[PDB]
Design a protein around this ligand. Sequence first.
Ligand SMILES: [Zn+2]
Ligand SMILES: [Zn+2]
Lengths: 64, 8
Amino acid sequence: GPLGSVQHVGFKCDNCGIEPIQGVRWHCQDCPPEMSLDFCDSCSDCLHETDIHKEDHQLEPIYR
Amino acid sequence: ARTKQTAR
Ligand SMILES: [Zn+2]
Ligand SMILES: [Zn+2]
């Protein structure tokens, strides 16, 4: 069943560039919907920043 | 990154 198995077809990571994140998605809470940034179960701890993406925020874990 | 496709 769920947890550690979640498939997010349509959400490739920004940290490592992996296709459609597996296990749990990490939806950026403060970065805008136009960007809609994402991290893997490991990458969500990486605390990354771009031109828009910053460490000023938090991420949301998605178990489904 | 939202690669998620949708209708026009
Ligand atoms: Zn990743
Ligand atoms: Zn972000």
